[PDB]
Amino acid sequence: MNIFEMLRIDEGLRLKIYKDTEGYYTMGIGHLLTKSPSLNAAKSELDKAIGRNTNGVITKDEAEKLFNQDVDAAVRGILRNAKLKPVYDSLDAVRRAALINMVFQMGETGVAGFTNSLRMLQQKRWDEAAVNLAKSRWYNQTPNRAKRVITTFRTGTWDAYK
Ligand SMILES: [Cl-]
Ligand SMILES: [Cl-]
């Protein structure tokens, strides 16, 4: 298993614009298009992203290409984040995948806000971090996914995804 596969499970794959769990227009593999309510605005961002007049539908290839860019940008965000980088640098490869996932779902900014879990993660206090991470809106809103990522931080294995 690896990051891509992991996120592909968590986000799914859809080739027509859809609304995510917060009600925002998304496409493909969790690629957010816009926080705005206008479908047109979404459609507009879609075409700009893709480089052509899609009329709200793309091919698998195009989805995957977004997806790759998005995975890349998440990594690069972490690395450039003063609060994130260090945590990430201290982690093992499986757990890094966990931090990526969160970042992908919630943005650097959002994740950098779990100061306390970050710190526990850094210190390798697995069970503790797992408890603290669960005290969050994130966990209450999307509990199954959050359970998956948390188990991953906790155990450092891919069990939650097998
Ligand atoms: Cl883009
Ligand atoms: Cl969920």
Rounded Cα gap, residues 46 and 53, in angstroms: 9
State the ligand closest to the CA atom of 140: 2
Query: CA 9, 12, 13: angle at the middle one, nearest 5?
Result: 135
Q: Pick from 46, 110, 65: which is nearest to 83 by CA?
A: 110
Say how far apart CA 152 and CA 97 lie, in whole Å. Answer: 9
The rounded distance, in Å, linking the Cα atoms of 131 and 138 is 13
Is 32 annotated in a binding site? The answer is yes
Type of residue numbered 80: R
- Say whether 11 is catalytic: yes
Angle of CA points 16, 21, 27, to nearest 5° = 20
Ligand nearest to the CA of 105: 2
Bridge partner residues of 79 (DSSP) = none
Q: Which two tokens stand for residue 58?
A: 């793309």
Gap between the Cα atoms of 36 and 19, Å rounded: 11
Q: Are 89 and 81 in contact (CB under 8 A)?
A: no
Residue with tokens 């603290």: 132
CATH number at residue 151: 1.10.530.40
Residue span of the structural domain in which 40 resides = 1-162
Q: Which of 10, 11, 62, 70 is catalytic?
A: 11
Instruction: Evaluate whether 121 touches 108 at the Cβ level (below 8 Å).
Output: no
Ligand nearest to the CA of 50: 1
Chain breaks in the chain (C to N over 2.5 A) after: none
Helices of type H across the chain? 3-11, 39-50, 60-80, 85-90, 93-112, 115-123, 126-134, 137-141, 143-155
147 CB contacts (<8 Å, ≥6 apart)?
Answer: 139, 160
Give the chain's radius of gyration (CA, Å): 16
* Centroid of ligand 1 to alpha carbon of 66 (angstroms): 7
CA of residue 4 to ligand 1 center, whole Å: 18
Residue 125, amino acid: R
How many domains does the structure of the chain reveal?
Answer: 1
Cα 101 to ligand 2 centre (Å):
13
